[PDB]
């Protein structure tokens, strides 16, 4: 639903690189491989965590809140 905080295999913190990953892809016109290496994810266990992630939270946010303050 949202980017996992840590890598499952080794526990490296990858939850703080989602926005950076998206910025590299969009603004810098970098391919997925270069963006991951730029972010410092060398082990393919970390690469798949960010490469294969699906951001479903954005889809949920389209719905109006059930309770509004």
């Amino acid at each position: 639903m949202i980017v996992p905080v840590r890598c499952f295999s080794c526990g490296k913190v990858v939850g703080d690189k989602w926005e950076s990953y998206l910025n590299l892809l969009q603004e810098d016109e970098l391919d997925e491989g270069t963006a991951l290496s730029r972010l410092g994810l060398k082990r393919y266990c970390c690469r798949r965590m960010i490469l294969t992630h699906v951001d479903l939270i954005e889809k949920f946010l389209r719905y109006n809140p059930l309770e509004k303050r």
């Binding site: 892809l25 016109e29 391919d31 997925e32």
Partner: peptide, 19 residues
């Protein structure tokens, strides 16, 4: 001997560019 990847996320731009 081939390309075992479904090249995406920049072929859409590639086609949109040459057009």
């Amino acid at each position: 001997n081939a390309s075992p990847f479904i090249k995406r996320d920049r072929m859409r731009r590639n086609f949109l560019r040459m057009r």
